[PDB]
Amino acid sequence: QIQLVQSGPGLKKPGQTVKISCKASGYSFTDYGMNWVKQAPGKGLEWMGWINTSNGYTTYGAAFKGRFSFSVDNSASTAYLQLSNLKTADTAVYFCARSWYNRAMDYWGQGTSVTVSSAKTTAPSVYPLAPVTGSSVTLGCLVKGYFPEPVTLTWNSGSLSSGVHTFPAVLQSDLYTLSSSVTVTSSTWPSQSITCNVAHPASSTKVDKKIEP
Amino acid sequence: DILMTQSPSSLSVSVGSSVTITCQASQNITNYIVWYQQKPGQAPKLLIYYTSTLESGIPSRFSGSGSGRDYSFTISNLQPEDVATYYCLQYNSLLTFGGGTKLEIKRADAAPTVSIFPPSSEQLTSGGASVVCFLNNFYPKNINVKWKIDGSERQNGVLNSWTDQDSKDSTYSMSSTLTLTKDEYERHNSYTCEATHKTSTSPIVKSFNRN
């Protein structure tokens, strides 16, 4: 039960500030340093620096001196990363990770995705995809015209998890599109109902779509 | 700053086969090297620290060795779960990551089970129309999808997307979506999804007519 759990995704315009947090639990917080790691989309892990949890003293990699701040709240047993004057190149997922010295970065947070963009936030249109068949049927869900990521999608509230392929979102004209498929036995549908649950937190939308013949 | 070159940057290897990744430091890092496994969308996981000491719970099929500037990491009896990007990291003076190694697993060639889907009427109110095509559980990753409207080819308006390799059966799936205006779509009659894979010289064809 050692865990680092980080705050959730954020969208910001260029010029603004973000502050991501990282709550450590299951161990004495001040005995271990905290590292921060940047991963820009389709790039390798990049080390930003660490913060000494006895000092509160920060150490920054060359590329991260200026608009970056590691801070600490020992009593909350958590760490923070503050980014001022956000540029588009700051779009990335950000990890915190325990330990500078013995077993370096031996526990990671789940990561926190930051998008820097002037694009407007728009809710997704969710379309059910019904067949126009062997012993099995594949149904679909098309999730169009939303910004930013993430959207999350389940089938029958996650009770249908096998046979599922959710495809990574693709950006076009500042709008993402994404889709999912489920194949089930021809005996089970439309006999039992199959429904597509889409959430888009950035627009506080939750839309359910039953697939109909 | 201490630099780290990682080789190779990507590779494809057989089930039960042996992987070897090498890492070169720009200077002596005195055994302070770690190796990470990064399955996609998940948090990275530490496998090895101090060149060769396995983190607890990490299977014996993993190992590392090296000194001075030269280090290597090995997976011996490759299983489908081992699919990931792997990273060396120097924690001597400051910390530096290697560039990564995206590991693909190899499996028996597999043809995409293909399925086509006409625009939902809920979408037709908007004035756009999307014909979606799923190509599921194929191997290898390379595949072309051709869109045919009433015999003729369509290139504009196609949008493609691929899963990461499946960590259970080692297949890929892709999704092709052709987007037209409601007017465009309402003019024509047959919509064709042609899949061309290494599995056969003749394409898998799925289609429908609006009637």
Place this chain on the structure above:
Amino acid sequence: GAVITDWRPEDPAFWQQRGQRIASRNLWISVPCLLLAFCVWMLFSAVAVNLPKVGFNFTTDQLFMLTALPSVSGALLRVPYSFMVPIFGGRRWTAFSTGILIIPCVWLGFAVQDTSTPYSVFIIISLLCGFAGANFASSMANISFFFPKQKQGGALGLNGGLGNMGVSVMQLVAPLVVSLANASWIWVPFLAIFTIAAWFGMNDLALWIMSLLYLATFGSFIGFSAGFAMLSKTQFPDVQILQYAFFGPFIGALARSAGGALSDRLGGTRVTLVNFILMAIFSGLLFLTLPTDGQGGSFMAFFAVFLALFLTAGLGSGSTFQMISVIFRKLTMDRVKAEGGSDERAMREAATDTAAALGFISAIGAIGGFFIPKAFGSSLALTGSPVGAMKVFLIFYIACVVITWAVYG
């Protein structure tokens, strides 16, 4: 978990984040493990005294010998012991070197009760008690690895200082527990407790003239600590010495701390010089205290003069160590300046060199705890006087103070 692969004490950030905490913990377990090894080292200084009282018929020369031999094996095992920590690691070696001490502690708990136990057996057990005397070398080397070069002083000071206090703790405990096996068994529970506590709590990291000066000062502290009780029973058989005989080693131990501080205050060579004067002067006044032919002796004086020889042997130990420390700092300064290097490099190498040399200086030094009581052995067995031996000490402390003049000052 027990093995530490990234150890950077000279790096302040590391020290703050984890070094200090880990080093601190290793010190705190190191200390009890060390004083216990001293307790075991000087056993016979409270056991050979009680051997006749349980029906053993041994010469005084045979009772001083048993008190003398642990420092022969101790001295011979100090050089090897200092190489053991880099090989097996602090935690593995502390546990082992502390654990195996149960063998000799239990053994003589039995042998002392069976009144038909040969002299050859007691020789072995005393020689196995000398193993504990080598623990100092390993303990001290271990600590030197955990602390940065300019924290090293205090930690080494704490480790050896409180370790040396082990003699004085045994002298006080062995009589009280005797209400014999008890003197040699009351430490089996403590040795075990602390072998376990090391094993689970400690960590494994991945000039001949100065031998003579340390020999004269420390070898004397251990030499007196061994034979004093046994001497204050052939000279005053009426008085039960084992309710006073602890106070000697106790006072001597505290005199180490003063020795170093006083030494840096007005000269390591000066305090050493003046101290050998007090070591010869006090060696002389002991003639006047003895019960001689016809003339009645005095205990109070004899005791108070030994209580002044323990003080003067204590100071001298902390005074010779600051001397050595200062000599090495100067040599490392000169070499590095000539190499054109850093004041920091010099500081580090002066600490490294004083620590690497210790396993050899303290081996030569420990030979004194054999001579002094074996001197009282051969003197009181050739004649009926301690004078014969005590005359050699006086001659020796003069020979030393001329040697401190000849080379320093």
